Amino acid sequence: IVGGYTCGANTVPYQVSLNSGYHFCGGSLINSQWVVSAAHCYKSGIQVRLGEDNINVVEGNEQFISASKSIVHPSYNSETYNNDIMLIKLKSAASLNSRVASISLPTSCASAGTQCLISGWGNTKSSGTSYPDVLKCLKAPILSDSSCKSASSFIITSNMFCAGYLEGGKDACQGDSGGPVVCSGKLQGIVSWGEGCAQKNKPGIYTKVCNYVSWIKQTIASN
Template identity: 30%
Template sequence: MFLHFGILLLLSHGLLGEVEVSEAIDGDTRIVGGKDATPGIAKYAVSIRGHNGKQDWHSCGGSILNEEYVLTAAHCIYQRRTDQVSILVGTYTVNKGGDRYKIKKLIPHEKYDNEWLRNDIALMQIEGKIKYSDKVQPIELLKEMAPIGKKCLLTGWGLTNYRRRTAPNYLQMLEFKTISNDDCTKQLKRSPYPEYVPVDVGQLCVQRPKRSGACKGDSGGALVIEDEKNKTVQIGVVSWGVPCSANFPDVFASVHGYYDWIQSKMK
């Protein structure tokens, strides 16, 4: 496990296809304790792979922004080289199927603070171009601030049982609800890690369902909502949380807070 002063970084060893976000978030689904996501729910989902010789494993999540760039958390690529990571797209199962791509460039935020987990956002530039298909599509970013009290959806291959270190084979999904940064700060002040607040403008918080939450391996994954036009858009990138399914908010990097930075790095 990758612990940072006791805080758990969730780091591990409208294009939804046939399924709408509104259908998914009405179900009894959770990542910790896990239920499988409906196939086709997240065609933008990326498994970031770690490498050691011939060994290959799921490390973090990410999302496809276009044919060349993947969005993830900065701590997912911190102090890594391009030859130490790759990506897998277009698969529902974490260890087979899909298309693999090598990495051309790693682009963490210049002001990423690995001690206090600020500016925890990054891009990965792919060698060549990602091939789109009925299983692989990009996700759009929400430029505006995400509304408070909005249902949202996270998908990932993070642990489904933290204590037992149980990892899923199939993609998992979980419904959250956005909360204000002020509310998030108040709650996290009562957590074991009050030194990591206040939550800043580059962060976004969600309230977990009971006995559920993002966990190790979900870092970098996309938090999405349906906008006013019923289009699926990304609002957050999994950053950190109190391990795992505790009754505290999960913290994400805010897409709105880093929208201009993301666009500038993809030019």
Template identity: 30%
Template sequence: MIRIGLLEGSIIPISKLRINGNTSFCKIGNNTIAHIVTKSIVHPEYDEINFSNDVALVKVSPPFKGRYEKPIKLYPPTEIFELYRSLYALGWGITQSNGTRPSEQLRIVKLRFVHRGVCRPIFQSVMSIPVPKEAICAGWLRRDMDTCTGDSGGPLFVNLGNNKKRITCPKLIPYFCGQYPALYMEVSQFYVWIKNETGIKI
């Protein structure tokens, strides 16, 4: 699953994308496995203006079965997401708000769930955009810890302990790093669509 917004303005069609895996480093190394996209399905209601339904499914070859490639269960729509206040984000994005170079190694940051009642007025006043119904907010209101440019599309997940994790959403908007909570797409809103399109038990 990827964000369609990540491909806007790209000269590379989605069918030509290569996803590198089996490594925590940004650069290609000995352990890197290149996964070629063989099929893609864009959400039929994708809205590039309001960031709504910004999601696509991709099938790759070879499949993600490398030594360091493990699946994470999707967050089911039957569970109450707000119960899990501690969240973790992964990415190779820049580590300084005024930086330009991505991180060479995959990084993780602990974030907090931010209620829509707090997040909605921030985005309406700062960016003049509504918070999509399938989005949630995460970050810190008074701490300089956040995802940033280059992390967009990366996962946000809940650690349930006993080596069990559930993915919640990829990041939608990478602006204002560390200043405001960020928007993330709630994957559970697409649970049925993903299941119907892939036929995979999730």
């Protein structure tokens, strides 16, 4: 997160960190046994870390649970980034509490202009590198489709939306990938990609979760 602020411990209780000896992607807890993340974060032997704030210190409230299945969307295209969504099943159901809680799937898509919360432990610099210890947050508005496409050097599919600030300085970034965009208490986005981070006229691009609700429910029910 570039140009954001320190969330405060466990103020984003659905935010999880994907770990393979180190943090590498975020994810969102959607029920006691399932996590929504990004297809491009796929890796085998993922450990899910829930209830995290400072990812480098054991503070308490953590739960570490191995991924038992990582289900990349069958139509995920690593070129075009279309369908950048992955479902992770935890080996064990998480113990849900005030600091480890699920976030609701949307019932309808979010609308342009709505301010949403984006969070993660990714890069906090637009040029250069600094990774935080504690969870960072950013409130950013969903941008219209036409300004998105006007800004982007790459094709924006109907499964993506732009959110953030065209003047630069405020954006998600590497390491936030797979993490949540929550608008009015609903998981509407997944940190997917962007042209660098926090550059002028180059907003963050996010997977449009509301397109996947039926797929998410069906997949979960058959696994």
